[PDB]
Write a structure and sequence with these properties.
This is part of a larger assembly, with chains A and B.
Chain A lengths: L8 E3 L15 E5 L4 E5 L4 E5 L1
Antiparallel strand pairs in A: 1-2, 3-4
Chain B lengths: L14 H4 L7 H12 L12
The chains are: A mainly beta, B mainly alpha.
Chain lengths: 50, 49
């Protein structure tokens, strides 16, 4: 089953530290390059980095 | 029967601010399920008894 579709461009956050990635956001022009992912099973955390 | 969700007054829809809504908006739904994952549940407490 599909879990997520990583966006092509990273979003913009002028003064925000956390951005809950909804379906209505504004993108920049720099491309997004995902490199890996990490799962923590003690607290059920998922991290995607790149 | 009362139905409860969580909403943020800065990123809410126009209806949820004047108390005329029936269905949660996208921000309210996402915030509600995110706070449900962290273990938040509401309960109603009567005051006189």
């Amino acid at each position: 089953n599909i879990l997520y579709k990583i966006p092509e461009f990273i979003p913009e956050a002028k003064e925000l530290d956390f951005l809950v990635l909804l379906d209505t956001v504004t993108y920049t022009n720099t491309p997004m390059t995902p490199k890996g992912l990490f799962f923590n099973t003690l607290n059920n955390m998922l991290y995607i980095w790149g | 029967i009362v139905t409860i969700w969580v909403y943020d007054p800065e990123s809410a829809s126009t209806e949820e601010l004047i108390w005329t809504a029936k269905k949660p908006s996208l921000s309210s739904r996402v915030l509600t399920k995110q706070m449900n994952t962290l273990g938040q549940r509401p309960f109603i407490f009567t005051v006189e008894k």
